[PDB]
């Protein structure tokens, strides 16, 4: 049995090799921040930050305030999954005197023929995620990291996302996202030899060491045109099933994980699966092996005056590196996904985000030290 | 208790009443208000209130939509969802059903303090959605508002969340993001006068039914958070730590009832004379009362890094005039807490009794 008190109780590390909200389960509730440094803050005043910043989320992630007025948001949940996640813009880097330490990573993801981004609300010197299962702890973290930058720092965007919590099925499973598809099958995992290599800087620029990056992108989801279809026109975009996310070349004993034949056709001769389906087109092995962790949250803002729905998905996906992952793919998708017709990108970001930090440390002590 | 409860508990769509106003309250919800198209009168309005019905009763459920259902609540345990409807003041006009508007619909007053935001406040429609996992929330928000169809837009809609079930070791009493304990002394059912408080008695259209008045109030967090605890816990009267009143001693707990003639070692008042927690009480306000069941809400930052934060405050009472009306009056320039929010939009709407079996919900107002 699990106890519904698992939701409070469960907590996630701050220290480890890793930092958290990487490899960390889905969580509930998401807030996502770009902070850019204020004018005349440099090297100093954003380490003298980052320690701030580690130093709260250290706290917070164990269920403990932060401080003396802290606002008791908080205050009487358990720290309910509860990951601070940090990183580094490309624009950090000639802020604080460390533009030879800047990953070439960070290079500016490709123009795409598809952007529609806002860039205002794009990129950012300093990028924090935070999830929790409770939507008050969540907000108590953001407004901690928030008022943690004080003026050496400001809000450039932040963006407000949520997912399945833990229980809402009678056993765990993979999550749905506005499309009403099943989203997150396929991921890389812990385990598999290969992961590390897909997904992290591996131990030998030396500071991202255990490190990772990550893209975001605010992908509004065209719901008015997407929720026309038919369901037979829904999975082709897709290549799987919506009742249970099982490959279209599955038969009904096919479930979620059998695997997808890209080769099956019709008795009239056509693929089953589609030649320009998401799900086949991203694949790592139609891809030179180009992977990603992907690890969203979904998001609904509001809706325009003619009842269009501001909603979408917060993508995120974690690469090593970022040519190996996000931009082959994207670049491919671009045009060559039927899935485009349907999304809007809108938002994007790249950022560093270093491996966690140990006892006593700070996250980007290496960089900033 | 099992985590699995968070999906599988169930509330009622059929009752005496509508659900979502004695319901506990949910982690997530959304508020929406309707205006009705051109072309759109009462049988547009009473067709409109049957495919609502219809799609409340499913979802609620654990259901899919009738038709053309997304998928989004696929797998998901009903999860506590309510779907709860009203009908504003204007609507009465739009639909040739003036001597049915009730009394009880006339508008607000235009206190000193209100930053209404016309354009985010009041609307023919009202509908709140609430549940504990966000997709079955978001695919009720979205399947009630595809059932508008040609016959209503959406002239508002503010999402709101709260406490998960689970996040703390045992259930306790709400806290909003001002950090205070919030929801102690709300009347509830089996408390002595709660009916005649909540629930018009069995124009007749409203039999059982409700008026809610909605508040969206921003928590102006920046002013508010520079603030020591000895004058945040004077502002209400209750202390952060465990929601007792101040005048409680070290025993004291939220339940703990108030002294409010108690004074210090100065003779000043323990609970101040303009504490929100005091003045608010019914006892203050000649018997007014009312049932509080609101949601948080955190929109983004502003260009300047203000929060859009506060609390979306849904009050139920039987009568406006003898509920939120007196009570705000009263808080308007009188409470302590004034100064710390601001209210930014508003709506007052009539809640009808619940649906019966094979019923939809104000069947009696507009058939
Ligand atoms: C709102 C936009 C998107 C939606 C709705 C969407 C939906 C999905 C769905 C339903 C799946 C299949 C189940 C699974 O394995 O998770 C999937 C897989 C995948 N998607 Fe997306 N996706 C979106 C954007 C993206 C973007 C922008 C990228 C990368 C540039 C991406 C990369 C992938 C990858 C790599 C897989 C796994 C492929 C495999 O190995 O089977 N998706 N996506
Ligand atoms: C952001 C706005 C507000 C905040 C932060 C707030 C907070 C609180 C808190 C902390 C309590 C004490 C605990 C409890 O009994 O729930 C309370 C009680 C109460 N508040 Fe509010 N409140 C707000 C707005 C309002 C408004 C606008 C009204 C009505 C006009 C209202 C009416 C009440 C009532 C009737 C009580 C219970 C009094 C009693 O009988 O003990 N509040 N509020």
Not at 6 to 17: D, I, R, T, V, Y
Not at 34 to 55: I, T
Not at 343 to 361: D, K, N
């Amino acid at each position: 049995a699990t106890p519904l008190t698992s939701l409070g109780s469960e907590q996630a590390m701050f220290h480890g090799k890793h930092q958290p909200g990487i490899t960390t389960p889905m969580q509930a509730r998401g807030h996502l921040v770009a902070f850019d440094l204020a004018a005349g803050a440099g090297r100093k005043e954003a380490a003298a930050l980052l320690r701030r910043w580690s130093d709260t989320a250290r706290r917070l992630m164990a269920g403990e305030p932060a401080g003396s007025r802290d606002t008791d948001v908080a205050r009487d949940a358990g720290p309910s999954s509860l990951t601070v996640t940090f990183g580094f813009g490309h624009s950090f880097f000639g802020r604080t005197g460390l533009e030879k330490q800047r990953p070439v990573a960070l290079d500016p993801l490709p123009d795409f023929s598809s952007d529609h981004l806002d860039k205002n609300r794009s990129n950012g010197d300093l990028w924090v995620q935070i999830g929790a299962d409770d939507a008050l702890v969540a907000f108590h973290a953001l407004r901690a990291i928030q008022r943690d930058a004080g003026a050496a720092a400001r809000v450039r965007w932040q963006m407000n996302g949520f997912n399945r919590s833990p229980g809402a099925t009678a056993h765990p499973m993979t999550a749905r996202n506005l499309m009403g598809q099943v989203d997150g099958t396929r991921n890389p995992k812990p385990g598999e030899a290969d992961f590390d290599r897909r997904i992290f800087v591996p131990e030998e620029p030396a500071w991202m060491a255990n490190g990772s990056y990550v893209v975001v992108r605010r992908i509004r989801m065209l719901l008015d045109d997407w929720e026309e279809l038919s369901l037979k026109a829904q999975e082709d975009v897709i290549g799987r099933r919506k009742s249970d996310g099982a490959p279209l070349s599955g038969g009904s004993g096919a479930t979620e994980s059998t695997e997808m034949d890209l080769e099956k056709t019709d008795g009239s001769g056509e693929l089953v699966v589609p030649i320009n389906a998401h799900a086949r087109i991203t694949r790592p092995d139609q891809n030179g092996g180009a992977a990603m962790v992907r690890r969203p949250f979904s998001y609904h803002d509001g809706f325009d005056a003619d009842g269009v729905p501001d909603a979408g998905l917060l993508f995120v996906c974690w690469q090593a590196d970022p040519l190996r992952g996000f931009v082959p793919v994207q670049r491919k998708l671009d045009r060559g996904d039927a899935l485009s017709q349907f999304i809007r990108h809108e938002a994007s970001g790249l950022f560093a985000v270093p491996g966690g930090a140990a006892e006593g440390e700070y996250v980007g002590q290496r960089l900033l030290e």
